[PDB]
């Protein structure tokens, strides 16, 4: 058929109850996760496909980068807090990865205090449970799904999609692919 196990996805052993709708990870620290997100910009032409009432979760993962991959997991977990990602995912992908000037938690946090972030607010949220809970949260997730590498998604969290079995391509046509893969899937 058009789509097929093994090929655009692959099939959950252990389907995930309760998880989020279209569940990504991703790493700051990911060569390709900068890829996916900044030049692909595969997260929003997903949402641009999804059906009416399915929501898009995005994770952070700390097995990239070491400590500062973990700070990269809490200040994610305060963007989440606060409703700032479409503020921060940008200079943060562009920090940790293109000027290199991220390379501890204080630079972290310069980009959210640059993004019209107050001081009092992050520093709060940095330290608040909720944030503790949300940190937790991505990690319990990675766990659920037995997350071996990122970039990674997984819808209803049964499907995990396969871009190895996409097309190389025009990246236009494997980003399209990768997106009306999701939508079939959310369907399912």
Known sequence: AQYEDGKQYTTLEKPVAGAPQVLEFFS???????????????????????????????????FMGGDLGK?????????????????????????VQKTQTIRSASDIRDVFINAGI???????????????SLVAQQEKAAADVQLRGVPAMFVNGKYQLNPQGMDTSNMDVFVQQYADTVKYLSEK
């Not at 990911?30 to 997260?43: A, D, G, R, W």
């Not at 009432?53 to 994770?59: D, P």
């Not at 700070?71 to 992908?93: C, I, R, S, Y």
């Open 118 to 132: 107050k001081g009092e607010e992050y520093d709060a949220a940095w330290n608040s449970f909720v944030v503790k």
């Open 71 to 95: 700070d990269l997991t809490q200040a994610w977990a305060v963007a989440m807090a606060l409703g700032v990602e479409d503020k921060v995912t940008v200079p943060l992908f562009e920090g």
């Open 28 to 62: 700051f620290f990911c060569p390709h996760c900068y890829q996916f997100e900044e030049v692909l910009h595969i997260s929003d032409n997903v949402k641009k496909k999804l059906p009416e009432g399915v929501k898009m979760t995005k994770y952070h993962v700390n």
